[PDB]
C-alpha cells in the first residue's frame, strides 16, 4: 500500500516496453522525480531513451517531461536538445506557464537553439501582461543560459520587476540570469534584492543570489 522499490520496478517495466508513447514517458519522469530517485541512473536512462524515441508530443507531456528533467537534476544534452524541435513546433500552442517551463528547461541544459529563444522572447515581449513574474524570471533564465545576449527581454523584465513586487526565488532566478548576462542594472537589481526579506523557503536560491551579486559586485545584502 506504500512501497518504493516495487513501484520503481513497475515504472521500469512500464518504460521498458517497445511502444511507449510520450505521455507515459512524461508521467514516468514526473513520478521518478517525486520519489527522488537519484540513486537509480539506469531508470532515468530508460526514461530519457524513451523520451528521445517518442514522436507524438503535445504541450502538457512535453512540459511535464522538461519540468521533471530539471527538477530531478538529470543531464543528457542529446535527448534534451532534441526536445526543442517539439518545442518550436508547439510554441504558439503553448500556455505562457508552459512556455516558461520549456524555455527555462531548455536553457538550463544549455541547448543552443536560437530560433526557440528568438520566438519565445518575441512572444513574452509581445504579450507581457499574460506573464506572472515567475514566468518572466524562468524565461529570462532560459534565454540567458541559452547563449543569446537578449537585452530586450532583460529590459522588459526590469520593467516588470520594478513595477511588480516579486517572490524571493523569482528575484533570485532573475539575478542569476542577469549575472550570466552580465548586465548589473541597479534599477533592476535593487528591485530584486528588496524582495529578499520575507524569509526564503530555499537555500539554493539564496546561494544563487549571493553568487549573482558576487558576479555583478553590488555588495553583500
Amino acid at each position: 500500500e506504500n512501497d518504493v522499490p516495487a513501484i520503481l520496478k513497475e515504472i521500469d517495466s512500464l518504460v521498458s516496453r517497445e511502444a511507449v508513447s510520450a505521455k507515459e514517458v512524461s508521467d514516468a519522469a514526473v513520478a521518478l522525480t517525486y520519489l527522488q530517485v537519484k540513486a537509480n541512473r539506469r531508470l532515468w536512462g530508460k526514461v530519457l531513451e524513451k523520451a528521445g524515441a517518442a514522436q507524438d508530443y503535445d504541450a502538457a507531456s512535453l512540459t511535464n517531461l522538461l519540468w521533471a528533467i530539471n527538477t530531478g537534476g538529470v543531464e543528457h544534452f542529446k535527448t534534451v536538445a532534441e526536445l526543442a524541435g517539439p518545442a518550436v513546433s508547439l510554441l504558439p500552442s503553448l500556455s505562457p506557464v508552459q512556455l516558461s517551463i520549456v524555455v527555462e528547461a531548455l536553457g538550463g541544459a544549455g541547448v543552443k537553439n536560437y530560433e526557440l529563444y528568438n520566438k519565445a522572447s518575441a512572444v513574452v515581449v509581445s504579450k507581457i501582461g499574460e506573464f506572472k513574474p515567475a514566468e518572466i524570471a524562468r524565461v529570462l533564465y532560459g534565454v540567458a543560459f541559452g547563449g543569446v545576449n537578449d537585452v530586450a527581454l532583460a529590459k522588459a523584465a526590469g520593467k516588470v520587476f520594478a513595477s511588480t513586487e516579486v517572490d524571493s526565488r523569482t528575484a533570485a532566478q532573475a539575478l542569476y540570469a542577469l549575472a550570466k548576462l552580465g548586465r548589473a542594472d541597479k534599477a533592476t537589481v535593487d528591485a530584486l534584492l528588496k524582495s529578499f526579506k520575507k524569509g526564503t523557503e530555499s537555500a539554493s536560491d539564496a546561494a544563487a543570489a549571493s553568487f549573482a551579486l558576487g558576479s555583478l559586485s553590488f555588495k553583500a545584502e
Partner: protein, 61 residues
C-alpha cells in the same frame, strides 16, 4: 538397314531432353530461409545472445 527403321533419337537423348534440369527440392526453401532467419533471429530478438540492440541504440546508464 533395320537400324534405320528404329527411332533415330537415342534413349540418352530422351533422358537428357526430358530430365534436362535438376529439379528443386522442397526442403531447400526451408533449409536456406531457416539458415537466413537464424541471422534475423540472432540480430534482432532482445533475447538473442548476440543481439544488436546494444550496438545500435547503445544504452543510457
Amino acid at each position: 538397314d533395320r537400324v534405320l527403321s528404329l527411332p533415330a533419337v537415342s534413349k540418352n537423348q530422351v533422358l537428357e531432353n526430358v530430365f534436362h534440369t535438376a529439379p528443386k527440392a522442397p526442403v531447400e526453401h526451408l533449409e536456406k530461409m531457416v539458415s537466413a532467419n537464424s541471422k534475423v533471429y540472432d540480430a534482432l530478438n532482445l533475447q538473442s545472445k548476440r543481439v544488436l540492440i546494444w550496438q545500435v541504440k547503445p544504452a543510457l546508464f
